[PDB]
Amino acid sequence: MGNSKSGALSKEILEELQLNTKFSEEELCSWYQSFLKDCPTGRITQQQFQSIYAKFFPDTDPKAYAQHVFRSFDSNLDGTLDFKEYVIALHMTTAGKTNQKLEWAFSLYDVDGNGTISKNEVLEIVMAIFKMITPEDVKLLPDDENTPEKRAEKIWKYFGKNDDDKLTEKEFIEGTLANKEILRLIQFEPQKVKEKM
Numbered sequence: 001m002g003n004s005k006s007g008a009l010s011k012e013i014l015e016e017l018q019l020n021t022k023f024s025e026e027e028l029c030s031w032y033q034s035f036l037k038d039c040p041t042g043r044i045t046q047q048q049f050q051s052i053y054a055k056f057f058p059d060t061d062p063k064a065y066a067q068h069v070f071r072s073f074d075s076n077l078d079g080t081l082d083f084k085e086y087v088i089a090l091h092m093t094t095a096g097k098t099n100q101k102l103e104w105a106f107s108l109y110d111v112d113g114n115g116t117i118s119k120n121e122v123l124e125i126v127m128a129i130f131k132m133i134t135p136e137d138v139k140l141l142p143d144d145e146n147t148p149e150k151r152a153e154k155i156w157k158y159f160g161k162n163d164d165d166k167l168t169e170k171e172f173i174e175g176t177l178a179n180k181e182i183l184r185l186i187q188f189e190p191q192k193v194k195e196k197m
Contacts, residue, residue: 013084
């Protein structure tokens, strides 16, 4: 009964996804079909998204991080993501694209969603990230970057901001482009590794 599919993806979505990922159309449609079986409305919740991460991080606690990630893609703030946003969200975590939408990195760090980043939002995200790595991974970080408080202080120092100043998106973009040290600090993802070599 073609011409009618409650299980059909969409050509706009399929395209956006093929652009931002390495998945083929056939791979996406097959994934979508299974996703519809556990999420029949075609939308996944905060709680289910967090459970995905909790199940694949045996030794750590990625829930707070997963919650921030979900929040950053939840436009209407429903507490739900459609297939496309859940697929892209799963991609933000593990690189697969660096300078990977500076757009997403900004949305993640603007916790309040007010349009700027404050130092408290920075600390909040960095704390969520530390909860997802192990004490052994932490032993591997630069001594001045090994705690949430230290990373956030340092990030704020590089963005040349005083403690009560807000960081705008234009500044975020300029900083990350102008100084490589800033980009590295921001896309904090040296999970057992350490770049900046």
